[PDB]
Amino acid sequence: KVFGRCELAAAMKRHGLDNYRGYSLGNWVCAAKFESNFNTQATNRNTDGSTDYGILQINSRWWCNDGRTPGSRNLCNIPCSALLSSDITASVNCAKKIVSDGNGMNAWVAWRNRCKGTDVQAWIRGCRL
Amino acid sequence: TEVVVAGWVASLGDYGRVKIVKVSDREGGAAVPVYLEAGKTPDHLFKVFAELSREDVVVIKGIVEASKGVGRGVEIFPSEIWILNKAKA
């Protein structure tokens, strides 16, 4: 599913991301935009054998289980297909654990490279929430 | 600007393309993030990231930069990582 910007904004607010750990909703929409172009089905295989799955590109080494990466912890306790659905619940619940890990949103290259320090609330501009 | 920092490992995080080691000075306080990024960090460092565990003493060489945004600290992009403390059996 390829979310609309405002659609996802609403979807993320309803799932409790706004100000979660002090990151306002614009951050989360902004990360989705650059991690996965909003595509819930986005997957990306890294040269080390891990894969990043879903709208927030959660990595398979520590965070979910996809069977095809050695010595893998499954800290989010879910299969990596659960992250490829239209229902972003699983992705969101896993993002919560990640962002609580001690590094906030620094867990995400795309957020780091393209959203951090910017006018992130621009990403909820024009949204009816 | 290249730089050398030293201290103990406060936390390790593996997020796939980004791996973060937080290095802390003897008497606590700030803990500086060191970022290993798959596009950019030299290959061998990943191997040593996988050897690191909490409270290990490291000497890290790398580039220091100011963090983006108003949360106004510093970030380090390593070119070498050395482990100082007694080796595990």
Residue numbers in the entry:
A (entry chain A): 1 to 129
B (entry chain D): 19 to 107
Excerpt from the paper describing this PDB structure:
In this study we have designed and tested the properties of a new protein scaffold based on the OB-fold of the aspartyl tRNA synthetase (AspRS) from the thermophile Pyrobaculum aerophilum. To demonstrate the amenability of this new scaffold to engineering for new binding specificity, we developed a series of OBodies with increasing affinity to a model target protein, hen egg-white lysozyme (HEL). Sharing a common range of epitopes centred on the HEL active site, these OBodies were also found to be efficient inhibitors of HEL activity.
Surface plasmon resonance (SPR) analysis with immobilised HEL and purified OBodies identified binders of moderate affinity (best NL8, KD = 35 µM). To investigate both the nature of the OBody-HEL complex and provide a structural platform for further development of the domain as a scaffold, the crystal structure of OBody NL8 in complex with HEL was solved to 2.75 Å. The structure showed, in atomic detail, a classical protein-protein interaction surface; burial of ∼1600 Å2 total solvent-accessible area (823 Å2 from the OBody) with a central hydrophobic patch made up of OBody residues Y33, V36 and I38, surrounded by residues making polar contacts (11 hydrogen bonds) and three inter-domain complementary electrostatic interactions. The active site of the enzyme was occupied by R35 from the OBody, in a manner similar to H60 from the known HEL inhibitor YkfE. Interdomain contacts made around the edges of the binding face were made by wild-type residues. The loop 4 (L4) residues of the OBody (positions 87–91) were ordered poorly and did not appear to make any substantive contacts with HEL. However, immediately adjacent to the randomised region, K86 made hydrophobic contacts via the aliphatic carbons on the lysine side chain, and a hydrogen bond via the backbone carbonyl. The NL8-HEL interface made no apparent use of the four randomised positions in L4 of NL8 (out of a total of 17 distributed throughout the domain), which immediately suggested that the recruitment of L4 into binding interactions might be a viable strategy for affinity maturation.
